[PDB]
Symmetry: D2
Subunit: 300 residues, 4 copies
Amino acid sequence: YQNDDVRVKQIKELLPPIALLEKFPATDKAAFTVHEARHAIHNILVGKDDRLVVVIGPCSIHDTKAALEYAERLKEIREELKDSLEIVMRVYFDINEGLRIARELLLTINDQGLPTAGEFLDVISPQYVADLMSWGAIGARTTESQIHRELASGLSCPVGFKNGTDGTIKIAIDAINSARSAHSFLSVTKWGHSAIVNTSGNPDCHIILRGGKEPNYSAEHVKAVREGLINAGLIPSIMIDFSHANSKQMEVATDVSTQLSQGDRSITGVMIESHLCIGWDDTEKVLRQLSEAVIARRNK
Amino acid sequence: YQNDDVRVKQIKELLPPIALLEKFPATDKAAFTVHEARHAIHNILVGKDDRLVVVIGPCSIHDTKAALEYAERLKEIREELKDSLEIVMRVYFDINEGLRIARELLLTINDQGLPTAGEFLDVISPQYVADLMSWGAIGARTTESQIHRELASGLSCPVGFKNGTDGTIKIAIDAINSARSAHSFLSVTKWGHSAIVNTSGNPDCHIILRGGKEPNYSAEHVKAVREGLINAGLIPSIMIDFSHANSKQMEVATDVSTQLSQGDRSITGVMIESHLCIGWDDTEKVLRQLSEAVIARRNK
Amino acid sequence: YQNDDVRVKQIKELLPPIALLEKFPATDKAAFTVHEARHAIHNILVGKDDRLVVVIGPCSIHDTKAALEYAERLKEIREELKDSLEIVMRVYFDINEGLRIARELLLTINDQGLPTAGEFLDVISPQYVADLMSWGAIGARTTESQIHRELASGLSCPVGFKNGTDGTIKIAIDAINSARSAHSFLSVTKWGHSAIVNTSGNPDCHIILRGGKEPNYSAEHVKAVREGLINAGLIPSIMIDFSHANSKQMEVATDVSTQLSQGDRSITGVMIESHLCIGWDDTEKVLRQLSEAVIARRNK
Amino acid sequence: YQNDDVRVKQIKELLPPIALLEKFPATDKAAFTVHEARHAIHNILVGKDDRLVVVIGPCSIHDTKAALEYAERLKEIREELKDSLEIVMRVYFDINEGLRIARELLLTINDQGLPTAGEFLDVISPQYVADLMSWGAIGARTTESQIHRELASGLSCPVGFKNGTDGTIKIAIDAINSARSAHSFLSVTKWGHSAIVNTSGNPDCHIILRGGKEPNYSAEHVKAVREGLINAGLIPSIMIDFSHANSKQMEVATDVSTQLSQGDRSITGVMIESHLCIGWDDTEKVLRQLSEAVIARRNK
Ligand SMILES: N[C@@H](Cc1ccccc1)C(=O)O
Ligand SMILES: N[C@@H](Cc1ccccc1)C(=O)O
Ligand SMILES: N[C@@H](Cc1ccccc1)C(=O)O
Ligand SMILES: N[C@@H](Cc1ccccc1)C(=O)O
């Protein structure tokens, strides 16, 4: 009797992580950009830094030429607005070729002094690119998954838990709470071998408001989230996704810029989808608006 | 700057799956029990067999001897009631030692002609035990998770998607729908190496009703689930968990036995938590009650 | 251009050593037999013990029941003659199946309290069986080989270097000299992965006289070997192979028994080829003769 | 008790070959140089091509800048003398760093259109570099060794067996004979995992005359070698090492150039040891003299 693998069409060796690290090692400059962006984001999350984190990028990378072009531009705005914003580029996507393309893109962008952000959707894919990642998001459909909370608990970067697809806040609050503890999960070593990973716990996790069944970017939605975080004993540190089920992106940015201007220190990050999705012209516009809002927040 | 593994306390090689298969190979009898229990469950799920699937076991295995003792008893009742019930034992839990204990327990129970059922929480631990598994659940917290639906799509056994922790049915309906397609995910080979797994799709998935905010086992909840499956184009095949957030387990069994007696052919399985959690005396009682209900279902 | 593997017909993963150790772990009795036999052989090689080492077995194992039967008999003579002889059974041979058969045979024989001896032809297959090996030979054709001297340098058991196929003594003297230093060589971990092995050096290496252009077992050959070891600064500890190019095995045994009787404390081991190659009756005869020779050696 | 690895100070994972191939892939130009040099060497060995193979290089590479400089010069002489000589550079050597340095050096040299030659001491390190190797030697100490003959049997390039350290010709003749059969040996996959390698047999193996107790390069030694190859049914194709125990290098070159001039078609290759060991000025003199000898061989 064939009981084994009756539903597997094919199972093929993946390059071990070490193969991608050898082919595409972090420069000293990449390694620094990553280290600095992770510290900066930590400082912003806890309120030691009054700047806003801004994860902004394409909906997805289809063409690496276009991404590198976007990165050159965004880099200049990262430099100019570095006193009001900490800008990080969202980079979202033969699987071996896919991994080579991905790591190489990430390395190049970090090596130009632009930190990068991604989506952690599995427990094996971080072993190939997390050394080039300054921030990651766990999806709304994986925020209650124990292995995804356990993964967060052992990641070197800060992490955002999206709320559930129906607006549920509690799963993210529990996710953040869980991710701060030590845990165990199964994945592979750098050498590609099945492994037990024991984590130390990650204090740098926070909620992402991405809509749900009702846009959660309102001041009262933000007020209710903040209070739910405070009750649970967590830092009231909140990132608002302008895209996805919050839509229109320009109207969200106006509404959020308001709250920042009124003096809401609880809103510590935002996410924006931006292409060469709003256009590049509108991307600059919104960034300058949020910048203005942060500076006004310093005062009022 | 040390960017790698800043939150990993320890990472150690796990035994490759091949090490546990070599130490604890399936006997011809184990292999048969597994193959036959998976076919039988398939036939029950589609309505070709009018027997009920019954996944019944401890809340968790704390002590293998107690489990082996429970298995000896349950086996005799599996044999006696086999014309009305297909009884499968729920087996739930140094990680290397843990894996040796688990596989050895599973092998012994299957080798005694008692099929076993598990819970898949990750994409790596199936490689160690799935060949001894006649059925598995995806938990309420992972039913919406892409990687878990992809896993289901490539598992050799039937799979139950629990509804969400708040009673939400839709995620299971979508899960079943997704699990029937071919998919890709990352895990390891039998040899323990990082891998791409390409799946062929699994038609043998069904919902599990486990409660949510309020219990969801009553005839009107079952009626609304059935209609929700039918509208989505799926076989109205429903398993009811008597435990968890449906509680009291004896009252659920009474209520369900009723519906089976009334002639509900759409209820094709149940789950029960039972120790040496209800006692052995009450475990036999409930099994005989469901058996009676199935017999009465034959007649009308 | 296809430059890679043009002359490899096929390359297939071998079971990692850990798979054979998990399937066939050393019993407490195996582990002890091995530990004690290796210490005893050490003591005999250095002159602290006045018994003779006797490596005796089939030309090769073709049939494991015949080997197990041979082992039962040899074991009784090991027990009876243990005051004069340290008897060790020579155990020489789908490669995965071959490895399972080999380890299982070795484990059974050691678990019955009969230590085993092998031949190291390569640097990878020790990882599968060395933990059950109380002694090993490097063959005449590899005694000069750097990789084999390096392997000897890192093995847990005593090792014999056969002289060259033409009678050359110096390669063995240099082999002993080399094997006692620390070295490095490439092979695999228990987990099956390519590896660097750093060795501590093995002082428990000695020459084996097997013949050459003409037999080399007589008192004059032994005298010149002893003097060649002394001049090189090494312990005059000599093992004489009764078989191979020394033939007459019994005539060799008579001649060697003589030298032992006359009081030659430099002859510390012998090799005998013995089947169910001399017969079982002649195997007992020779063992009792050497026993007698050891006893008589005590008295002079 | 503690029977495993009592003489292993440390054992560490080595980069899998795939990590070095991914970091330092063969360019199109490297791959071609290798393909062409291996075919050319084949043609010279069998007598289809009346040029001489010349393996010439440093005693060993300590400094890669000096090697690259040597390679640039040798390359110009490879190009100029290509009608009379097929010139190949001898390239001999944290082992992970060592492997990176080695592969990178070899890749650079082949990518400049200069084929490279090495020395096979083990069965694992070919997986890292053999794809950049146009030719290799088995040394005098391993020519008789079974695993080395088996390795030769599965290598993609031609191979030379040196005669034994005492002048013995027969081991090389037997080595050639054995290397042309299919064999099995243990080593790793490109992925770094323990493996069985099944070979197809390598007809492109030949003797290397490297001395012994007395030099073996004169016409009468060559005559006796040739006749020993002929009687064994083998192509009388002979390579003469000018170095090692043949010394003086310039006197050997004179004597050999003679035999080539007198019309000896059986001498198909030579080895020379050369750094910027004879000097660069003397390296050109012998190459041009051998060139002249080849040209004279063409005529009478
Ligand atoms: N390498 C990850 C942690 C990790 C290890 C192993 C598996 C998965 C994730 C990091 O440095 O963030
Ligand atoms: N072995 C699983 C399928 C699988 C393969 C590889 C990784 C994970 C899962 C089954 O038979 O159900
Ligand atoms: N396992 C061998 C040492 C060894 C390790 C690795 C490769 C080869 C040999 C011994 O214990 O004696
Ligand atoms: N890769 C070698 C052959 C080889 C394979 C595996 C192990 C060792 C050697 C060659 O191509 O010539």
